[PDB]
Design a protein around this nucleic acid. Structure first.
Ligand code: NI
Ligand code: NI
Ligand code: NI
Ligand code: NI
Ligand code: NI
Ligand code: NI
Ligand code: NI
Ligand code: NI
Ligand code: NI
Ligand code: NI
Ligand code: NI
Ligand code: NI
Ligand code: NI
Ligand code: NI
Ligand code: NI
Ligand code: NI
Ligand code: NI
Ligand code: NI
Ligand code: NI
Ligand code: NI
Ligand code: NI
Ligand code: NI
Lengths: 271, 94, 95, 273, 264, 267
DNA sequence: GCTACTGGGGCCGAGGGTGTTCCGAGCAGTGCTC
DNA sequence: CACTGGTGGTCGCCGCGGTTGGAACACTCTAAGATATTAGA
DNA sequence: GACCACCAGTG
DNA sequence: GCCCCAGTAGC
């Protein structure tokens, strides 16, 4: 009797696990505490499981997670992604070769970049502009957008600073955790649909370029403003508030349901 | 109208009959029905008022991320836990 | 997205873990979830393929007049009965 | 704990009980067969419970069914209503006094009658017609409708015969119609009682103990209930009662009659102004 | 006429309502010998019995001991529309309603009401007389009186507990009487709005005559569970005084004073 | 491209190095610069610090079966290096480069180079014929009754013992092959001869060394006819992959097959 | 019914040519009672 | 922890101002060899 | 007569 | 070292 993954839209967004060993008991994903408190995890119903520091995963656990099509993501402090294990062959050859074909030809690559721009800012990109120019426009627009959300939500803002060194400043932590959730479910979606997260168009060079493209498209529409809202209240547990808030945002926005057709419509530029 | 499941444990028969008034006892102590929000709240009034010494957990269909929510009454080896908003069940060891 | 509940009795631990893969085990042998039609049918394939010795009952939300439906696998003292289309549960005596 | 009743729309249509004794076990409405098979019944979650010959209900059973606002309807052949029991004071004073005020004045009564005619047939009634003349027109239209459905489904028709006392040897069509319309009269009576009105205070029908039930149910009878009885009568099965109860259940679920009954009552009485 | 049946099964033998008891004492009842049958706890009714009562038009009312409570009744909502429209016409017309209220006052208090008094004025007179009666009974039976204070059970005063139970029983027998006569318990004249207003009226007519002085009589003592003691005392008073039988002519006279042609 | 197989222990980090603690207490300290790929066999438990270290130094983690018999999971999923994925994909899209890679696969599988006139489909037919003759010839060499390759895909227990042994053997071979394709940094779905399937490249590279050892071993196990032939063939392929170092020899083969396209490698 | 314990055994359930079809009252002596 | 059995004890759980997408099939190709169709990719 | 509360015994 | 399987009481 086989065991196959369920579609992504029918799953929950994410599950954060910490401080405990992850075993397989009777064929189930189980999180055992140091005190012995067993906690079953419906791995087949989650899009991705974030493994915080303190989690000792077993071989059967990674096997089971991969078999039911649930991405494992080792994360560090503030939920920043450290590593990930998934299906060693979840990519469909037609979609993977299509994505790669669009990535190799620079014409279709420019078409996909401009399509990403138009889908991001709701207006067509300026004509006769190169990929670098559109990326610089993206930088200025994102900077001014962070500033505008800052003035609207009444949060002290000075810059992005994604490095946790200069934090010491809870807004950057909230944005990093929120965008970390979005990157987790986005990488999970890209793996599920059959595409390559490393083959990208805008954020080329980075190992998760396509994840950064797709997620950067819908970042400020849903996830970042909620991070500013969590940051304004200044709670004692910013990570938990950002995770719960992102969970509600993904639920109400149907993010998991819209991620794959977003990718298809993005790559649909090169007919 | 949402789906309702009430599973009871070590409760006096008064609560089992009361639950049998509106719900369908498909297994020993497992009740299934389809009620509204106010009817669900009334049934929970019955549960909290009549269990006295048993553990009863009630789940109902909603529009949350998991599609349903649940709450408990009384102590049980299977205790709910909160994981950044998503409520799961942990099994306390002996 | 319909709500699902599966109550197993005297099944091997394989079926219990397999049900724990997708559904939440709220009480001993009582699993709750929210799945589609196909996922429910697959879960019923797991049950019919792994119950082997026990009795399982599966109930899910529908558009029926009762609001839900249910089917069983195996034998139990509580047997579904048909009352003019309205299916209830009867309690058989000893024997 | 008070255990207050459930709204009627949330309930199930009907449940028929054939044999065994009905007891209350730990506060539960239980049907005990002569073999010992206990069958708990969600009395609180069903609109009306039909009691066929062979049932022996207890005092605590009628008390429980009445307390949870579930009408008890003792029935006979083809489920034709014989008796009923419900709450002793389940009527609302304001709605009952409104229905009474409409019934007392001749003008308001004629208004309600014209509203019933306009909601039953697809055209308003002629003006300045008394209650008797409109009742005769209703009779002719109903007879022609029976004949029309009989010719549509191809059933040997002789005329509507309400009571099973007047049944002949192989009259099955009137049996199906009687069972179906009996179910409709059951849920309609349960809706009238639940809403707080009096089932005996009628406007078109008068003097009969269920006049208002026959009015409100006669308004929406032929839309869905009768032609299905003509279909089942055309099939001529072995168990016509169970088939008619199935089809009536699916019609009450599809048309959502149990939820629409009270708005039909208030819209009919609203014409009294 | 009516009969109380308890502790046995009701079936049909050769065309008669038979009550079968655990001792084997059959109680045969012709179809026309009873207008109503009060079913006390412990009665199981066969389908043939309900069918016969339907064929002859006999009312079945599931009640408590001596009608202390009214749980259910056959022909729900009333089977006679003539009496319902009679009471309703008595209630909607201001003149007739006032006449009926005045009749309630004259049959409750030994003297007729002051003329040209409205229903609210007679209501105030009624409240004052009720207060004086509460104080008088408190002095007569030696019960510490603080008022009609009750928190909407056990965490409260004992005298108001006994009064509450007694009035509950009286609303029981009064409801059974109103149902037996064929009238609606919701259509009231002094009380208006609640589904048991008429019960509160007819019960208010005879409240302080027997059941409330008995409640103060049990309050004079200090027994465990005063609810049960008051319920049983009210039961024995309703059986001994035949309150249910005497309440129907009282209703027919209260409504009769409206000077309307009554239904036969 | 170096790698190591860890088994029956817990992988922690001590003094900034991978350590494999055994059931007996035998620590195996592994420097970060000494291995580029860690195969995790059954019985291993991975700690968070180890995954963080492997992430920061770019070490690939692949949860596999014993001796890479099955590839269950792999870190950096979907492909880590994009230049290698676009290199393989570029080789597979252009028909000239595709035909070149296919021809190199042919010349490596059979010692003789393929005829130059033929296209990919004709080389596929030649492959089919040679595989047919090889099935018959092995069937006579080991003396097993051969009625063909046909099996029942629905039920496994309805096929011949020889078809079970061949199928299990090719399963293990797809295991090690997939491990080599992942360790080399290429996509298993981007195939040349086989296309459309998510493991087409695994079938391509695995078809090259299939009838060199593992399939004859399947005919040997079928000849001996044990009680559990699937387990015997799986353990036999395990021992073949361990003793002959098949996984180590596969990666240069991949790089050479793709190198015959005459396009500059990523490097 | 379920649940805990505890050696013994196995590392395991696969197979691949391709895409296309708020308000009245009283009445006692400002509160009670309806 | 659910079900069963027998016997003593109760008939009860109340109050009452009115109103405001997946599989069926359709195919390429080749070398053996039923020199047609078939087994293998 | 119907129904509940109590208190173990067994699987 | 991880995990399933079988029997064996115990409540
Ligand atoms: Ni970016
Ligand atoms: Ni009519
Ligand atoms: Ni109360
Ligand atoms: Ni009063
Ligand atoms: Ni298979
Ligand atoms: Ni149980
Ligand atoms: Ni154990
Ligand atoms: Ni052990
Ligand atoms: Ni061991
Ligand atoms: Ni061992
Ligand atoms: Ni096997
Ligand atoms: Ni084929
Ligand atoms: Ni004075
Ligand atoms: Ni018993
Ligand atoms: Ni007994
Ligand atoms: Ni007894
Ligand atoms: Ni006794
Ligand atoms: Ni008040
Ligand atoms: Ni030849
Ligand atoms: Ni091949
Ligand atoms: Ni007795
Ligand atoms: Ni070992």
């Amino acid at each position: 009797l086989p065991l196959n993954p369920i579609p992504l839209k029918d799953r929950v967004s994410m599950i954060f696990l910490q401080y405990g060993q992850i075993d397989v008991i009777d064929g189930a994903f189980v999180l055992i505490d140091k005190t012995g408190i067993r906690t079953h995890i419906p791995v087949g119903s989650v899009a991705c499981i974030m493994l915080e520091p303190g989690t000792r995963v077993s071989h059967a656990a990674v096997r089971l997670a991969a078999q039911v099509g649930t991405l494992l993501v080792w994360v560090g402090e503030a939920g920043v992604r450290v590593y990930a294990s998934g299906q060693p062959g979840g990519a469909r050859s037609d979609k993977l070769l299509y994505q790669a074909k669009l990535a190799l030809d620079e014409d279709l690559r420019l078409k996909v970049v401009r399509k990403m721009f138009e889908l991001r800012f709701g207006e067509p990109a300026p004509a006769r502009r190169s990929v670098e120019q559109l990326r610089g426009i993206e930088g200025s627009r994102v900077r001014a957008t962070y500033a505008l959300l800052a003035k609207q939500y009444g949060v002290t803002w000075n810059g992005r600073r994604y490095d946790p060194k200069d934090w010491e400043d809870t807004i950057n932590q909230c944005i990093s955790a929120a965008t970390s959730c979005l990157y987790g479910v986005t990488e999970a979606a890209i793996l599920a649909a059959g595409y390559a997260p490393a083959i990208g168009f805008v954020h080329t060079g980075k190992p998760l370029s396509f994840v950064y493209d797709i997620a950067d498209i819908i970042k400020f529409d849903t996830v970042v403003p909620k991070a500013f809202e969590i940051a304004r209240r200044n709670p004692g547990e910013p990570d938990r508030e950002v995770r719960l808030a992102c969970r509600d945002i993904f639920r109400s926005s149907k993010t998991l349901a819209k991620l794959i057709p977003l990718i298809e419509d993005v790559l649909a530029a090169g007919e | 109208m949402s789906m309702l499941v009430v599973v009871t444990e070590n409760v006096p028969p008064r609560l089992r009959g009361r639950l049998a008034i509106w719900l369908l006892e498909v297994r020993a102590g497992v009740y299934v029905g389809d009620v509204s929000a106010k009817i669900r709240e009334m049934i929970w009034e019955q549960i909290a008022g009549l269990a006295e010494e048993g553990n009863v957990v009630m789940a109902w269909a909603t529009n949350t991320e998991t599609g349903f929510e649940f709450q408990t009454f009384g102590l049980n080896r299977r205790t709910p836990v909160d994981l950044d908003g998503l409520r799961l069940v942990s099994f306390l060891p002996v």
